[PDB]
Amino acid sequence: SSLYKTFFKRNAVFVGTIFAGAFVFQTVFDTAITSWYENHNKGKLWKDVKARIA
Amino acid sequence: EVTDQLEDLREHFKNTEEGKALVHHYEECAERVKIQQQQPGYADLEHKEDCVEEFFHLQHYLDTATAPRLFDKLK
Amino acid sequence: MTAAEHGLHAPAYAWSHNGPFETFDHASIRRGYQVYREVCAACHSLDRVA
Amino acid sequence: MAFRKSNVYLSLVNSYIIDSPQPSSINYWWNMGSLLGLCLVIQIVTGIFMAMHYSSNIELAFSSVEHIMRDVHNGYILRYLHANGASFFFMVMFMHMAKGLYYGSYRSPRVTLWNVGVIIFILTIATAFLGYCCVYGQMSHWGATVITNLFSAIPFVGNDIVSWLWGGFSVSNPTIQRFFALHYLVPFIIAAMVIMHLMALHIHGSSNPLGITGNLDRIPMHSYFIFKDLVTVFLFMLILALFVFYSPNTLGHPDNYIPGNPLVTPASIVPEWYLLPFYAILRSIPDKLLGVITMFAAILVLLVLPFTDRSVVRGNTFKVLSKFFFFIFVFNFVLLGQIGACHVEVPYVLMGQIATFIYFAYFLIIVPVISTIENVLFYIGRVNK
Amino acid sequence: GPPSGKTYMGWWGHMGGPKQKGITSYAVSPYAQKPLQGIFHNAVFNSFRRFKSQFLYVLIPAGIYWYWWKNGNEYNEFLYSKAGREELERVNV
Amino acid sequence: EQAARAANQGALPPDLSLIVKARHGGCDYIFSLLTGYPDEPPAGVALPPGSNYNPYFPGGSIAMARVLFDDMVEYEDGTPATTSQMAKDVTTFLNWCAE
Ligand SMILES: CCCCCCCCCCC(=O)OC[C@H](COP(=O)(O)OC[C@H](O)COP(=O)(O)OC[C@@H](COC(=O)CC)OC(=O)CCC)OC(=O)CCCCCCCC
Ligand SMILES: CCCCCCCCCCCCCCCCCC(=O)OC[C@H](COP(=O)(O)OCCN)OC(=O)CCCCCCCCCCCCC
Ligand code: HEM
Ligand code: HEM
Ligand code: HEM
Numbered sequence: 001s002s003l004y005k006t007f008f009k010r011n012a013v014f015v016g017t018i019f020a021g022a023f024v025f026q027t028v029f030d031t032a033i034t035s036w037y038e039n040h041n042k043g044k045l046w047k048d049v050k051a052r053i054a
Numbered sequence: 055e056v057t058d059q060l061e062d063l064r065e066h067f068k069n070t071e072e073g074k075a076l077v078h079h080y081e082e083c084a085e086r087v088k089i090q091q092q093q094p095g096y097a098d099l100e101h102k103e104d105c106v107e108e109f110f111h112l113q114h115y116l117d118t119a120t121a122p123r124l125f126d127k128l129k
Numbered sequence: 130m131t132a133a134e135h136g137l138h139a140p141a142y143a144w145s146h147n148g149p150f151e152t153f154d155h156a157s158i159r160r161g162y163q164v165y166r167e168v169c170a171a172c173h174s175l176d177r178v179a
Numbered sequence: 180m181a182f183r184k185s186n187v188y189l190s191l192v193n194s195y196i197i198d199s200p201q202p203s204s205i206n207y208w209w210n211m212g213s214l215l216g217l218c219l220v221i222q223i224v225t226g227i228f229m230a231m232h233y234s235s236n237i238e239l240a241f242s243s244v245e246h247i248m249r250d251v252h253n254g255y256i257l258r259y260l261h262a263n264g265a266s267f268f269f270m271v272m273f274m275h276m277a278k279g280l281y282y283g284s285y286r287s288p289r290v291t292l293w294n295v296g297v298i299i300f301i302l303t304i305a306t307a308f309l310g311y312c313c314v315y316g317q318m319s320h321w322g323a324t325v326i327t328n329l330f331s332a333i334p335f336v337g338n339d340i341v342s343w344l345w346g347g348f349s350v351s352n353p354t355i356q357r358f359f360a361l362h363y364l365v366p367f368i369i370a371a372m373v374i375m376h377l378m379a380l381h382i383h384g385s386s387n388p389l390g391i392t393g394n395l396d397r398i399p400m401h402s403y404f405i406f407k408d409l410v411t412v413f414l415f416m417l418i419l420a421l422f423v424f425y426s427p428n429t430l431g432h433p434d435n436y437i438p439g440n441p442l443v444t445p446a447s448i449v450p451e452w453y454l455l456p457f458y459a460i461l462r463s464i465p466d467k468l469l470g471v472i473t474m475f476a477a478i479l480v481l482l483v484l485p486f487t488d489r490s491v492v493r494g495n496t497f498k499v500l501s502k503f504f505f506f507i508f509v510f511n512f513v514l515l516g517q518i519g520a521c522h523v524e525v526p527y528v529l530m531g532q533i534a535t536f537i538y539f540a541y542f543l544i545i546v547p548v549i550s551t552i553e554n555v556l557f558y559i560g561r562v563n564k
Numbered sequence: 565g566p567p568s569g570k571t572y573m574g575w576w577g578h579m580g581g582p583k584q585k586g587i588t589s590y591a592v593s594p595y596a597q598k599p600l601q602g603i604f605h606n607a608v609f610n611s612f613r614r615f616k617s618q619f620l621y622v623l624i625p626a627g628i629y630w631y632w633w634k635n636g637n638e639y640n641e642f643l644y645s646k647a648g649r650e651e652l653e654r655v656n657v
Numbered sequence: 658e659q660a661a662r663a664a665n666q667g668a669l670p671p672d673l674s675l676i677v678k679a680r681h682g683g684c685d686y687i688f689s690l691l692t693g694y695p696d697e698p699p700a701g702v703a704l705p706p707g708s709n710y711n712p713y714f715p716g717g718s719i720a721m722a723r724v725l726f727d728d729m730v731e732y733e734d735g736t737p738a739t740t741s742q743m744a745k746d747v748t749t750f751l752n753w754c755a756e
């Protein structure tokens with residue numbers, strides 16, 4: 001409602017926020033996807049086999 | 055001490071009569087071609103009987119029965 | 130052609146790397162090089178692997 | 180006036196993708212032509228980045244494709260997007276031509292627009308053949324042997340074209356080096372034919388599924404069809420990504436992972452899936468010179484289509500008999516691809532011969548007879564007498 | 565340059581149709597209509613209605629070409645078996 | 658190549674870097690090829706001198722004999738090295754060599 005120049009009114013905030021979030025989203029989506037993949041396949045990676053030959 | 059797992063399952067599914075229907079069908083083929091190949095004269099021939107078709111019918115059933123059942127027995 | 134000239138059809142075993150979310154089993158890659166070095170390398174090459 | 184209408188360069192963009200008048204009743208079958216412009220861009224960009232690492236010598240060609248797969252950083256993404264993108268490029272073009280065969284887009288005044296489209300289709304087949312021989316697998320050597328031997332049957336000039344295509348006495352090192360240089364070039368001839376294609380479209384515009392005049396209700400291109408073009412682009416890139424990342428060798432053949440050998444022949448020689456209907460037309464003719472004529476006549480018979488349609492209504496929306504025989508022709512084209520992937524045996528030499536007869540009898544017999552029957556049926560069902 | 569040969573389409577203002585007189589049109593803004601109204605009564609029924617019209621022009625040509633392939637296929641498997649060994653002869657040549 | 662055919666009675670054993678992706682079947686074909694040699698051929702067949710029967714090979718007769726038997730290697734982790742166990746591990750290793 002009364003948040004529009006805080007959100008998406010300005011030409012330089014319509015592209016000055018979707019370019020701002022384009023790096024914040026770039027690193028937190030990359031970390032959470034990698035964290036899910038290495039627990040669905042836990043026990044088969046090289047990190048788990050090298051700790052078994054200790 | 056432990057034999058290999060694929061030949062253990064290959065005989066346990068030969069202990070069904072679904073298997074004995076195909077075991078006996080191939081053994082009947084083998085005893086027809088062997089009262090043959092000793093009768094007097096061959097290299098007379100241009101075509102004679104094999105048992106390759108009856109072989110594959112028994113092999114196909116054994117792989118439908120042991121393929122989803124094996125890799126839980128291996129490490 | 131006949132089924133003798135085509136070959137038998139291989140069945141569908143359940144490999145641990147089948148699926149869209151699966152990884153190779155690195156303990157079965159390690160043991161697989163031990164069977165290559167002792168049984169297989171007497172007649173076959175592996176020329177593409179550094 | 181606005182700056183986008185007075186500039187020399189911005190006015191061409193404004194007159195083509197911004198203020199272009201469109202019929203407001205076109206459906207999602209009119210989205211295939213923009214999607215083919217995205218397919219040409221992906222093939223040119225991924226091929227230029229792969230040409231930096233490729234060697235065209237016959238003793239280095241197979242191993243340099245392996246170098247891209249194993250050593251180049253993200254090199255497997257470039258090849259898989261390139262080899263699977265060519266199948267997606269041919270799938271949309273088969274759906275693009277079938278729409279204009281349905282809605283009657285070949286008739287006057289769009290005959291020149293249909294004739295430039297046939298030239299693009301021949302250059303796209305020639306492009307995919309030349310690049311498939313550059314991998315130099317075992318399918319690449321024997322597919323290039325069979326095709327180039329067909330030109331030795333031309334009367335009184337046959338042992339010249341084939342010795343000029345080979346650069347020698349067989350498919351050898353001069354053949355692979357000249358096939359890559361021609362493969363760089365024909366994608367730029369296709370892009371110039373695409374520019375001439377859109378010029379003939381701008382003077383008359385598009386048709387509509389009703390098949391009547393559309394000058395009574397028009398909406399602009401911008402803000403209405405750009406967001407409808409955007410829907411099928413995101414569907415295209417998602418199904419393409421499912422093949423590149425989850426099943427990248429399904430639309431291929433495992434014999435292309437063997438290096439090519441002139442002294443060992445494979446047990447089964449089969450082309451890619453989009454050349455299988457035309458491969459089966461060739462093997463049906465027992466002559467050798469008559470076989471190579473019929474396979475090229477299967478693409479040039481699309482140019483007789485403005486002359487054999489004798490109907491007075493444009494399209495297939497209200498034509499009962501013409502809607503039945505349109506799907507006889509479609510499934511006969513899927514039966515022709517299945518025959519061309521089988522062995523040459525004896526239920527199949529007669530199935531592939533009758534199905535080649537249905538291909539040519541649709542254009543020259545079935546269309547001009549069914550067209551005039553519906554002209555008389557529309558007349559006596561209305562005129563009270 | 566010069567003007568070229570005439571076509572059957574124009575531009576905004578002179579599109580080239582018949583003259584109109586006596587037709588009225590009305591519309592309401594998208595900002596006043598409810599979000600995603602035509603999502604039901606659309607494909608669960610409409611496209612279930614449009615399929616039922618145009619399906620019998622597809623399924624009868626499809627059934628002839630799938631009967632021809634399945635019946636021609638099972639005669640090839642018979643000719644390359646042991647029971648079909650004599651009929652492979654006198655047919656191929 | 659002449660020295661390879663000289664030790665294998667004319668036959669040439671191929672390179673195993675891309676053998677998974679160059680065969681109809683993939684991982685299922687290389688596993689079933691090794692654990693598929695019969696103890697005796699079917700009745701009626703006639704093999705050439707110096708051949709072996711394997712029904713997964715097109716034609717029936719192959720120039721490679723059976724090379725996997727029980728307890729021929731000794732694993733470091735302690736896994737029992739049976740015929741099907743060792744044949745599983747080469748196919749997992751060889752699929753990595755291709756991909
Ligand atoms: C491999 C290449 C991948 C990319 C290919 C792109 C798709 C090509 C398919 C060809 C095609 O476009 O045919 C469309 C045809 C007629 O289209 P129509 O305008 O009459 O129906 C618009 C309707 O009002 C929804 O229109 P709507 O306004 O709802 O748009 C939203 C719709 C968009 O998705 C698509 O339609 C993409 C095809 O999504 C939704 O429905 C939301 C659901 C919650 O629909 C049909 O008649 C169905 C026939 C099946 C076609 C199969 C082709 C065989 C290969
Ligand atoms: C020389 C080479 C030339 C190429 C030859 C042809 C190659 C075949 C390529 C296959 C894709 C072509 C199939 C679709 C063809 C376009 C059909 C079309 O344009 O739409 C017609 C129809 C629209 O419906 P209506 O407009 O009539 O609705 C009533 C409104 N009053 O919409 C429909 O009826 C669509 C119904 C579903 C069609 C798809 C069915 C499956 C087609 C077989 C595909 C097989 C792939 C292996
Ligand atoms: C319309 C455009 C194009 C089409 C349809 C096309 C088609 C093909 C096809 C089907 C292959 C075989 C790939 C395989 O089966 O693995 C190939 C290979 C290749 N193409 Fe293209 N191509 C196009 C444009 C280009 C362009 C412009 C270049 C410019 C350099 C290029 C470079 C290559 C290269 C280097 C190969 C090497 C083998 C490989 O990467 O697999 N392509 N092309
Ligand atoms: C790289 C190849 C091609 C490209 C980029 C292309 C592009 C286009 C585009 C953008 C349109 C505008 C209408 C629409 O989007 O559907 C169109 C229409 C058309 N195309 Fe193509 N096309 C190509 C190949 C072909 C081929 C192979 C044919 C026929 C053999 C063809 C025949 C036509 C016809 C007749 C129309 C007009 C259809 C109508 O207005 O109803 N084009 N094309
Ligand atoms: C222990 C692991 C081994 C594996 C996984 C393996 C695998 C294979 C494979 C996949 C083939 C090709 C089958 C085909 O062409 O379709 C082959 C062929 C062959 N292998 Fe092996 N092999 C092994 C060991 C050996 C050994 C110890 C020898 C010793 C003489 C040998 C000799 C051959 C020969 C002569 C051929 C050619 C067969 C033919 O072309 O008829 N292999 N092997």
Ligand SMILES: COc1c(O)c(C)c(C/C=C(\C)CC/C=C(\C)CC/C=C(\C)CC/C=C(\C)CC/C=C(\C)CCC=C(C)C)c(O)c1OC
Pocket residue numbers: 194195196199212213214215216217219220223224227370373377380381385
């Ligand atoms: C109503 O009808 C329509 C209509 O529906 C549409 C969609 C359009 C929209 C137009 C199109 C879809 C046309 C598509 C355009 C093309 C296909 C142009 C051809 C493309 C090229 C020639 C590609 C250009 C080449 C490159 C970009 C080379 C790239 C290589 C690079 C960047 C390597 C760089 C190297 C280093 C080291 C940086 C119309 O114009 C139109 O008519 C009114």
Ligand SMILES: CCCCCCCCCCCCCCCCCC(=O)O[C@H](COC(=O)CCCCCC)COP(=O)(O)OCCN
Pocket residue numbers: 185186187188189191192374
């Ligand atoms: C196969 C050939 C394809 C044909 C190309 C057609 C499509 C080309 C247009 C694509 C967009 C490019 C437009 C550039 C942006 C507008 C340029 C401009 O403002 O015009 C010029 C800027 O001058 C330049 O330096 C042009 C640089 C060209 C750069 C080429 C990469 C301004 O010109 P001017 O002020 O006179 O505008 C007329 C007002 N009545």
Ligand SMILES: Cc1cccc(-n2nnn(C)c2=O)c1COc1cnn(-c2ccc(Cl)cc2)c1
Pocket residue numbers: 304305307308309311312318321322323325326448449450451452454455457458
């Ligand atoms: C034979 C064979 C055997 C194995 C792989 C291939 N092959 N060649 N290229 N591609 C992509 C492919 O699959 C091929 C070629 O098959 C065909 C079929 N028709 N054509 C053809 C048609 C017109 C022109 Cl101008 C050129 C060629 C080529």
